[PDB]
Design a protein around this ligand. Structure first.
Ligand SMILES: [Cl-]
Ligand SMILES: [Cl-]
Ligand SMILES: [Cl-]
Ligand SMILES: [Mg+2]
Ligand SMILES: [Mg+2]
Lengths: 145, 145
């Protein structure tokens, strides 16, 4: 078991794991992925076993208010995905604590995350990772003019 | 009739409208107030009629990702409150309007807002201001160490 930060050579591995986490086009993924590698407050970790990417974790540092938090800035889990076969092997636990370490570096005392209201699978994963539910919100949007 | 930005001369009027939107002590309100005034990315509008303050609006500019939005940065409604007697004036609409113009200076094309899942009368208020629901989200938090 090995954990590496994502890079340009890690791009293909990252993508196909990212492909399963979020629903988007390949073009949008790779565009989002490229700009994350050049971000100061963005964490991309890849987990390896037998030289094969089996899981991934993306996180960031949030300076703007996160719903449910009491400090700022805070660590934020953008998403974490583990291959359906290498699940139940405690790799998500491994990735998440190294994310906490990374965020601890920036003197963060609090790690936050969000899930859709109906994604019970992710809700369970969060509870297994040490998170407690804070609040539930409804988001709105509107075009200017 | 007259909409004016909050000022240090209008703290008390701003205060009496803000506490009934966020329950908190006067000392702590005033402290966040004094910082918002000095914050370039924050907006504080007071609505006047009959020489009294009947409504208030607070908004900000978000560069970090906001649930449901498609662009960045975005304008973000922090809170809007109108005196019960004046909730048929269109004052809220005008306030939103003046907030969107403000967000235009930062090249925002989207205006986002959030609300408690249980606050159903706030959802109606958003909908009557042109806001459309985007995502329902549950948040999590976890202390580092
Ligand atoms: Cl996730
Ligand atoms: Cl989700
Ligand atoms: Cl009233
Ligand atoms: Mg999330
Ligand atoms: Mg809100």
């Amino acid at each position: 078991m090995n954990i590496k930060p994502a890079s340009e050579a890690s791009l293909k591995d990252w993508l196909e794991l990212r492909n399963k986490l979020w629903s988007d086009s390949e073009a949008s993924h790779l565009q989002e992925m490229h700009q994350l590698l050049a971000e100061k407050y963005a964490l991309q970790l890849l987990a390896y076993s037998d030289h094969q990417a089996i899981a991934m974790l993306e996180a960031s540092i949030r300076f703007e208010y996160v719903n449910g938090t009491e400090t700022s800035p805070v660590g934020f889990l953008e998403g974490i995905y583990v291959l359906p076969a290498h699940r139940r092997s405690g790799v998500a636990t491994m990735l998440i604590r190294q994310a906490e370490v990374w965020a601890k570096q920036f003197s963060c005392t609090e790690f936050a995350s969000d899930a859709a209201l109906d994604n019970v699978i992710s809700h369970a994963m969060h509870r297994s990772l040490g998170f407690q539910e804070t609040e539930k919100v409804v988001y709105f949007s509107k075009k200017i003019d």
